Amino acid sequence: KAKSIDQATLQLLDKAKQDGVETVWDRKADMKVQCGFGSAGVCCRNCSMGPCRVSPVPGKGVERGICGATADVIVSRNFARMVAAGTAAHSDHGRSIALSLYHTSKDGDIKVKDENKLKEVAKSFNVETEGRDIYDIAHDVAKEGLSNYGKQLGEVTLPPSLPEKRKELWRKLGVYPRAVDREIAAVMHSTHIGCNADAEAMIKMSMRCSLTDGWMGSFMGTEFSDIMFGTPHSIDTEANLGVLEKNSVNVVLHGHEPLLSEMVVEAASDPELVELAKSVGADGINLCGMCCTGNEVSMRHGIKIAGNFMQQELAVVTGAVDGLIVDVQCIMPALAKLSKSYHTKFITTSPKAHITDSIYMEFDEENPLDSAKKILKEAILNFKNRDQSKVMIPELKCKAILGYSVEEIINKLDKVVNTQIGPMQTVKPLADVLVSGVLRGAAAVVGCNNPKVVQDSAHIETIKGLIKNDVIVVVTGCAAQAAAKYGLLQKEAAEKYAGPGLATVCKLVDIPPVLHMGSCVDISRILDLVGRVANLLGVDMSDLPVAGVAPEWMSEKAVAIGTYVVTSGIDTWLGVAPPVTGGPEVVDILTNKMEDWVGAKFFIETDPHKAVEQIVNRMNEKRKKLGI
Amino acid sequence: MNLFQTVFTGSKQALAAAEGIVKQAVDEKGRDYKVAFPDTAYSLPVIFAATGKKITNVGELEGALDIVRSLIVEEEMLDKLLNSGLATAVAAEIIEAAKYVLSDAPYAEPCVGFISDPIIRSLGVPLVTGDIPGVAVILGECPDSETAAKIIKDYQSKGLLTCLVGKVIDQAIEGKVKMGLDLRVIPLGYDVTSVIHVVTIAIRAALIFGGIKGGQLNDILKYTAERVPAFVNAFGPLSELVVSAGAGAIALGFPVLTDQVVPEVPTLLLTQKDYDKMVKTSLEARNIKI
Numbered sequence: 067k068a069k070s071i072d073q074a075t076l077q078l079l080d081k082a083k084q085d086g087v088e089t090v091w092d093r094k095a096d097m098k099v100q101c102g103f104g105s106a107g108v109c110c111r112n113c114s115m116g117p118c119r120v121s122p123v124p125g126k127g128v129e130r131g132i133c134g135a136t137a138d139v140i141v142s143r144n145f146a147r148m149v150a151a152g153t154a155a156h157s158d159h160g161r162s163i164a165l166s167l168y169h170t171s172k173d174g175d176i177k178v179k180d181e182n183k184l185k186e187v188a189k190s191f192n193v194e195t196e197g198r199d200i201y202d203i204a205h206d207v208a209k210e211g212l213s214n215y216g217k218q219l220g221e222v223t224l225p226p227s228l229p230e231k232r233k234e235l236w237r238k239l240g241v242y243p244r245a246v247d248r249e250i251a252a253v254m255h256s257t258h259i260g261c262n263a264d265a266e267a268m269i270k271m272s273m274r275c276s277l278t279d280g281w282m283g284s285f286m287g288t289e290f291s292d293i294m295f296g297t298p299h300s301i302d303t304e305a306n307l308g309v310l311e312k313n314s315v316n317v318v319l320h321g322h323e324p325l326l327s328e329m330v331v332e333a334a335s336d337p338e339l340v341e342l343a344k345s346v347g348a349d350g351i352n353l354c355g356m357c358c359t360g361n362e363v364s365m366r367h368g369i370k371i372a373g374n375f376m377q378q379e380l381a382v383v384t385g386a387v388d389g390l391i392v393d394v395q396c397i398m399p400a401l402a403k404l405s406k407s408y409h410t411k412f413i414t415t416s417p418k419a420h421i422t423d424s425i426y427m428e429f430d431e432e433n434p435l436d437s438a439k440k441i442l443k444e445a446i447l448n449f450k451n452r453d454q455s456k457v458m459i460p461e462l463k464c465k466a467i468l469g470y471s472v473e474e475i476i477n478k479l480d481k482v483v484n485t486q487i488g489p490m491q492t493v494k495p496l497a498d499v500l501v502s503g504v505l506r507g508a509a510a511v512v513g514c515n516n517p518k519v520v521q522d523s524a525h526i527e528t529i530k531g532l533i534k535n536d537v538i539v540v541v542t543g544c545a546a547q548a549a550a551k552y553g554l555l556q557k558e559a560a561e562k563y564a565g566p567g568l569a570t571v572c573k574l575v576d577i578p579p580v581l582h583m584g585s586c587v588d589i590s591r592i593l594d595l596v597g598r599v600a601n602l603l604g605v606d607m608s609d610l611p612v613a614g615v616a617p618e619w620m621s622e623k624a625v626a627i628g629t630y631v632v633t634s635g636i637d638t639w640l641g642v643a644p645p646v647t648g649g650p651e652v653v654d655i656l657t658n659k660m661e662d663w664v665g666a667k668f669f670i671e672t673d674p675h676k677a678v679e680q681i682v683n684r685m686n687e688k689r690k691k692l693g694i
Numbered sequence: 695m696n697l698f699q700t701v702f703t704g705s706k707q708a709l710a711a712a713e714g715i716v717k718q719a720v721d722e723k724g725r726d727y728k729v730a731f732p733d734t735a736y737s738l739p740v741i742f743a744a745t746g747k748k749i750t751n752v753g754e755l756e757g758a759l760d761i762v763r764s765l766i767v768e769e770e771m772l773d774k775l776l777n778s779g780l781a782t783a784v785a786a787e788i789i790e791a792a793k794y795v796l797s798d799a800p801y802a803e804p805c806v807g808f809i810s811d812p813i814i815r816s817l818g819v820p821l822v823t824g825d826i827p828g829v830a831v832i833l834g835e836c837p838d839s840e841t842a843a844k845i846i847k848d849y850q851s852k853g854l855l856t857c858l859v860g861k862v863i864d865q866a867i868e869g870k871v872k873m874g875l876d877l878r879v880i881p882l883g884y885d886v887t888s889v890i891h892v893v894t895i896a897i898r899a900a901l902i903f904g905g906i907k908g909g910q911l912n913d914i915l916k917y918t919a920e921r922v923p924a925f926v927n928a929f930g931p932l933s934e935l936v937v938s939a940g941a942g943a944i945a946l947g948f949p950v951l952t953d954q955v956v957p958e959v960p961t962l963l964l965t966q967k968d969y970d971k972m973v974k975t976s977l978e979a980r981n982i983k984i
């Protein structure tokens with residue numbers, strides 16, 4: 067099987083073979099046939115009476131663990147713990163953002179750059195704004211956001227875009243969210259030996275936990291990031307490994323937390339550091355981003371995107387990365403080993419993510435700019451250790467357009483609003499094109515890479531099929547970066563891949579057929595958008611012809627995302643089977659009974675063409691239900 | 695019934711009416727009997743633009759229903775909707791041709807029916823010059839004669855060439871609107887199919903001024919969209935046939951504005967209840983400068 071559809075990826079894999087270094091593909095091959103029990107989710111290790119493995123085939127072999135737990139119980143608890151872990155990752159990201167908001171000041175390193183956005187958020191949090199200092203408002207907003215994480219009395223605060231009907235449905239179902247850390251703790255408590263042994267209740271607890279990610283953690287992280295670093299607008303950038311410069315210092319930012327990458331971008335324009343880069347013999351400083359931190363700095367500043375998850379190692383294989391600065395999440399620990407074969411400084415900066423044999427330079431949030439300058443100076447000084455004979459940068463990079471926040475999308479939609487009719491600054495043109503049938507629907511393509519799928523193949527095939535069927539596509543994360551590398555994030559792509567209705571819409575609004583809405587936490591934006599559409603049409607989000615796809619997901623964060631997208635009322639297709647096939651009841655809940663609960667359900671489909679067909683059929687049947 | 699289904703239903707009704715009237719013409723006059731429009735050089739302009747074929751006898755008119763049949767594909771995608779609008783336009787043209795071959799004088803005053811080529815050439819000079827900054831196709835009935843007269847005279851005072859289809863003709867007559875080719879208020883006919891008589895004005899504008907040869911349908915549609923500043927104001931309740939004819943106008947690149955609740959399409963299908971702002975809304979939608 068081919069390892070990737072990306073030519074630059076293939077060239078660097080040949081180079082890695084020539085250099086005698088191992089990749090994620092090599093380790094996947096070394097793992098050989100993976101354990102069937104773990105793959106089906108019928109293995110349990112929740113107590114030291116175990117490990118227990120029960121048969122993935124009902125009626126044969128061992129039926130219960132030592133405590134008496136069935137295959138359905140073991141599967142449901144394993145799934146719930148994946149959701150809890152994903153929720154924890156996203157919530158910790160949002161908590162750091164809220165703490166940064168709490169420390170903003172007029173003369174400090176972290177300021178308020180979008181005051182209108184802050185005032186709207188303050189309105190959503192019942193924070194007074196009129197005749198008040200902007201930083202007093204910011205601190206009050208940060209306090210309310212922080213209380214969302216750990217309040218023990220009262221109800222949490224949810225964005226106004228969330229329909230009232232969806233909230234009432236959640237309350238009736240018993241999944242209405244509480245404080246984020248409280249829900250994570252509840253899931254961890256109920257999976258403990260001898261607690262919850264009922265699959266339906268376990269799945270409902272996991273949905274309840276995932277809601278605190280989708281609508282509170284990721285949402286607050288995104289909106290506070292907009293407040294502090296600016297709301298994204300349409301902006302040009304370049305993507306894929308070709309963005310590395312042979313004659314410049316190459317600094318690659320990998321990870322998820324945006325404050326460090328924002329401070330590194332600011333430090334790169336420091337005159338002393340630019341002079342130092344010139345003095346070490348480089349033309350300048352070339353900042354490139356990877357994964358979600360790359361998505362953030364690219365959405366807000368046009369920083370070039372070096373690559374997505376399964377390309378991170380190959381970035382080092384070029385031999386041109388002088389510094390690789392990582393914060394947390396989706397940072398392959400093998401990088402520490404791999405950087406030994408090159409001059410690269412692999413720099414960890416977060417106390418949450420220590421990696422053995424990496425260079426640890428703790429990013430100081432109290433003095434973010436000075437700390438970022440010190441880290442960047444280490445990367446720049448490493449340019450003297452470059453071995454130019456080992457350098458091979460593929461001449462493969464692609465132009466991309468991104469920055470499509472909900473605000474930017476609304477601004478673009480204002481173009482097709484007749485001034486004599488109005489209203490302006492709404493999602494009404496999008497609702498109109500969806501209701502009329504010019505657009506069949508909207509689909510979110512999100513998720514990681516996975517060695518089980520030819521890298522980027524499923525993302526590209528799913529996106530092309532959807533836009534060919536007049537389904538407008540919004541992309542986040544590594545899927546968005548796969549689209550960027552391929553060339554879908556271009557206005558020209560409208561006439562090259564889209565169907566007639568979507569091509570007309572793209573021409574009228576002057577947008578690409580695929581809209582890059584940011585990082586994984588920025589999936590909250592997608593929720594926001596859908597909610598607005600629903601609130602404009604007076605229906606629940608489960609009545610709309612919308613869907614989400616995770617063609618190549620790998621992370622626990624992806625599991626939590628799919629769970630809260632389904633719980634919000636949006637059908638979700640998974641291109642990688644989750645470890646639930648061992649529990650028939652869990653499969654039936656996720657793919658059949660969920661529709662009775664929240665009006666949406668999971669679809670497991672490993673063939674992208676079949677997934678596109680199923681998405682189109684499901685959207686059409688929801689349209690016929692809605693009468694459009 | 696959604697927009698696509700409404701357009702498909704309208705196109706099927708137009709096809710049924712065309713089949714009935716063609717059967718009547720075949721029964722009364724014979725398949726060798728001549729089929730023509732008064733003083734034109736492009737036979738039936740819509741069929742000539744779509745295929746390049748000139749319809750000369752009744753048998754060929756009966757064979758032209760296959761064009762309407764092949765232009766109706768009931769799949770909910772935008773291209774099929776535009777093709778279905780074009781099917782309605784072809785069916786309306788066939789109905790008008792059958793009217794002309796059945797009756798010696800199908801239209802009486804003030805209705806003018808078909809517009810001859812010399813009138814098109816006369817209007818071409820003020821069209822490109824800018825003395826005619828647009829073509830207002832008014833179809834249906836306004837709630838009052840006063841509002842219809844007000845809108846029509848507002849268009850007239852701005853130099854636009856306004857064409858009238860339906861009961862709006864009677865409302866304008868009650869409103870003391872002075873009509874004629876020099877007064878730029880042209881009543882086409884009381885039936886919806888009479889709207890084709892302004893559609894052929896645009897089509898022949900591509901045939902005469904644009905120089906596009908017959909059968910180059912995409913070139914004709916591009917020319918009408920980028921050169922002919924026409925728009926539709928549909929007043930009063932809209933049947934499926936009216937919506938299908940509006941889909942044809944959209945296929946020609948002409949935006950359709952109405953006072954009725956319809957599934958809106960930005961820049962193409964717009965609802966404007968306020969009759970005091972309909973003229974400005976149409977001028978903005980068609981990008982017309984006075």
Ligand code: SF4
Nearest residue numbers: 110113116118131133
């Ligand atoms: S919780 Fe039950 S099934 Fe799991 S390891 Fe312990 S005894 Fe075995």
